[PDB]
């Protein structure tokens, strides 16, 4: 109420712990006591694209611009 800042009563608000595997993450979280929510890893899906398919003859995949 004097400067327009965001104070907090949260010492733990600026923790982050970058790990390398989900197993050690869950093991450390269960080791140190508190609860935890696991979200699963999502890779980009591999696709099938080609420039010749962008220059189709009777397929509708057509670049239409260039």
């Amino acid at each position: 109420p004097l400067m327009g800042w965001a104070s907090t009563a949260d010492p733990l608000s600026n923790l982050v712990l970058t790990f390398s595997t989900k197993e050690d993450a869950i093991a450390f979280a269960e080791k140190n006591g508190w609860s935890y929510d696991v979200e699963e890893r999502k890779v980009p899906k591999p696709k099938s694209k080609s420039y010749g398919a962008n220059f189709s003859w009777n397929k509708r995949t057509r670049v239409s611009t260039k």
Binding site: S56, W57, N58, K59, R60, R62, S64
Partner: protein, 41 residues
């Protein structure tokens, strides 16, 4: 032969290219289609 066998080019008017494309439109095999009539149909 040292005589300019052209001047057959000389009479060319500004419509003659589209005129020749117009008149030579027959015996045209159907320029093969592909699915839709257009990229957006």
């Amino acid at each position: 032969n040292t005589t300019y066998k052209n001047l057959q080019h000389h009479d060319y008017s500004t419509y003659t290219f589209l005129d020749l494309n117009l008149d030579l439109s027959k015996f045209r095999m159907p320029q093969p289609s592909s699915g839709r009539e257009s990229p957006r149909h």
